[PDB]
Amino acid sequence: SGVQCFSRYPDHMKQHDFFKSAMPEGYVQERTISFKDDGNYKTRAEVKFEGDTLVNRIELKGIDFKEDGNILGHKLEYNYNSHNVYITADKQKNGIKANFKIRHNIEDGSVQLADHYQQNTPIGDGPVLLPDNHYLSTQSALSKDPNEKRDHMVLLEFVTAAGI
């Protein structure tokens, strides 16, 4: 989810792709992520091109986590469920909002809900595409590099726009 500009927007929906329309100057993406019965993350990111490279620069602040809840207690499985990102225009900010729910698998067969609220606003002042309501269908696979001893994550993600 940090670089939604790489979603595949079908040709028939290309007039709804805010994310690429803000490039190269980019957009600011902000989120509040609320973990049910636990703390929250607030994030601010700038997504823009630096030369021919797409850069996602993020500051994350997490507060009010429980010392031994599922997050600081590391009780979440190393996997990831498919989900939809529901997008709506925010015409007053020349950008978009999104709302979705992530379900993190807990090692005991339970689920840790993470409510996501997101806003994006362009960095540049050129025209952007303000979309009709739609969603991004996201699939993610997490793995490890067998030769890597540092703490790390390998991520494969597919994101397809749909709903119109």
Place this chain on the structure above:
Amino acid sequence: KGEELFTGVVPILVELDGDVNGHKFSVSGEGEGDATYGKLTLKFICTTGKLPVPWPTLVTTF
């Protein structure tokens, strides 16, 4: 116009600085994206030591 920058494979850099309950950390990631296939491949490294939260909780941020 912006869409034109995405018709091929694009290198991606990700840089995060975090503070969760006073645990400070940084993550650097590299990979590439190919929007034609809505496909992203990235590898993230915690450069400050051990990640103080579970990796899955940062996927949507990255």
